[PDB]
């Protein structure tokens, strides 16, 4: 049975934590990449890592919820920085025909709530806020995001007592070559001028020319639609998030970032404040209008045409935008199923 085989593979690999390209300790920055099944975009991220300055000793953790030869071969080609692969142990690939996959007794995602209650399908009493029922493939990303946040801070042996920041990104992102240069200055700038800052972001989703802006950073209230790429957390920031575990895991939104938005408004004692450059050091390649080759060339052109402005010698805080009161987001749904709630709440308790 291939499914059972994969379960055994994932258990041993998550235990062994084989570190590639290391004979060193992780310091200052570690990257964690959420990976599913888009190797064409992963290849683009890896190319951006290859071209990035100063990261020979930056650990990059790839977190997978899908096993494939192509994906593992891509990551195995990385010879230029420390690499670790970890594997989400409750993926749909490992549990296809039972929760958190699709139990054949589950309610159809679009069966009306009133009909589901009369039918007795097993999750009929737990629709989302729109009266819909769970779809396994739409719940997986939030599960994977919350599991790997716990796993890297608590269960990765090389990160015992780690005192740097961990920067979270995704398989379809592209890093600017000065991203690490800029991160280090951003962190020093946070220590010097923004003690109220909770998190760092490498950039938002927005100029053709970088003149006068590539050296500027803003202090803003964190907002999920703007600041969900390349999010760097301290241990303190992570510990404050897990104080809101039940809220994260029960809030009826299958988006991890919209769920964080709700947390910053409803469960954290203060809104998150983020330090973020005016010129992004991270780009979303999985968005167009996508040919991955087209995306890479356009980003290459934008960054190289602006080469004279990259690697700024000094960063300065230019703007401060402080939200005092804000409406909570509307729920996007997809997260009403108590089994999703309970599995999400279990990650830090199991083993
Ligand atoms: O089953 C899945 C599907 C997606 N993702 C991850 O969710 C992130 C966002 O997915 P995508 O970029 O497709 O969504 P979009 O950016 O279009 O909202 C990516 O890092 C994927 O690797 C995942 O972890 N498990
Ligand atoms: Mn994307």
From Swiss-Prot:
Record's signal peptide: none
Pathway(s) annotated for this protein in UniProt: Protein modification; protein glycosylation
Enzyme class: transferase
Subcellular location: Golgi apparatus membrane
Keyword Transferase: yes
Cysteine disulfide partners in this protein: 107-121, 194-197, 244-267, 249-344, 288-290
MF annotations from Gene Ontology: alpha-1,6-mannosylglycoprotein 2-beta-N-acetylglucosaminyltransferase activity; manganese ion binding; protein homodimerization activity
UniProt-reported outcome of changing residue 201 to F: In CDG2A; strongly reduced protein levels; loss of enzyme activity
Binding-site list for Mn(2+): 172, 284
E.C. numbers: 2.4.1.143
Cofactors (names): Mn(2+)
Membrane side Lumenal: residue ranges: 1-351
Reaction catalysis annotation: an N(4)-{beta-D-GlcNAc-(1->2)-alpha-D-Man-(1->3)-[alpha-D-Man-(1->6)]-beta-D-Man-(1->4)-beta-D-GlcNAc-(1->4)-beta-D-GlcNAc}-L-asparaginyl-[protein] + UDP-N-acetyl-alpha-D-glucosamine = N(4)-{beta-D-GlcNAc-(1->2)-alpha-D-Man-(1->3)-[beta-D-GlcNAc-(1->2)-alpha-D-Man-(1->6)]-beta-D-Man-(1->4)-beta-D-GlcNAc-(1->4)-beta-D-GlcNAc}-L-asparaginyl-[protein] + UDP + H(+)
Glycan-linked positions: 1
Function of the protein: Plays an essential role in protein N-glycosylation. Catalyzes the transfer of N-acetylglucosamine (GlcNAc) onto the free terminal mannose moiety in the core structure of the nascent N-linked glycan chain, giving rise to the second branch in complex glycans.
Record-stated family: Belongs to the glycosyltransferase 16 (GT16) protein family.
Protein name: Alpha-1,6-mannosyl-glycoprotein 2-beta-N-acetylglucosaminyltransferase
Native species: Homo sapiens
Stretch of the intact protein here: 86 to 447 of 447
């Amino acid at each position: 049975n291939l499914t059972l085989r994969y379960r055994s593979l994932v258990y041993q690999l998550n235990f062994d934590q084989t570190l590639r390209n290391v004979d060193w300790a992780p310091r200052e920055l570690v990257l964690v990449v959420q990976v599913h099944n888009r190797p064409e975009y992963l290849r683009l991220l890896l190319d951006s890592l290859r071209k990035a300055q100063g990261i020979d000793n930056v650990l990059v953790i790839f977190s997978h919820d899908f096993w494939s030869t192509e994906i593992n071969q891509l990551i195995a080609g990385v010879n230029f920085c420390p690499v670790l692969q970890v594997f989400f142990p409750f993926s749909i690939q490992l549990y296809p025909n039972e929760f958190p996959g699709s139990d054949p007794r589950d309610c159809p995602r679009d069966l009306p709530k009133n009909a589901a209650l009369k039918l007795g399908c097993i999750n009929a009493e737990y629709p989302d806020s729109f009266g819909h029922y769970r779809e396994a493939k739409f719940s997986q990303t939030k599960h994977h995001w919350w599991w790997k946040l716990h796993f890297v801070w608590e269960r990765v042996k090389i990160l015992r007592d780690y005192a740097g920041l961990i920067l979270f990104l995704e398989e379809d992102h592209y890093l600017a070559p000065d991203f690490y240069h800029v991160f280090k200055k951003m962190w020093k700038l946070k220590q010097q001028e923004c003690p109220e800052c909770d998190v760092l972001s490498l950039g938002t989703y927005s100029s053709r020319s970088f003149y006068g802006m590539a050296d500027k950073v803003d202090v803003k209230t964190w907002k999920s639609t703007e600041h969900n790429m390349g999010l760097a957390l301290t241990r303190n920031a992570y510990q404050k998030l897990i104080e809101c575990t039940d809220t994260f895991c029960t809030y009826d939104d299958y988006n991890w970032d919209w769920t964080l938005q709700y947390l910053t408004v409803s469960c954290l004692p203060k809104f998150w404040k983020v330090l973020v450059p005016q010129i992004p050091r991270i780009f979303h390649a999985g968005d167009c209008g996508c040919r991955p080759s087209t995306q890479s060339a356009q980003i290459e052109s934008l960054l190289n045409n602006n080469k004279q402005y990259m690697f700024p010698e000094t960063l300065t805080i230019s703007e401060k935008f402080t939200v005092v009161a804000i409406s909570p987001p509307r729920k996007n749904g997809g997260w009403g199923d108590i089994r999703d709630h309970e599995l999400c709440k279990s990650y830090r308790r199991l083993q």
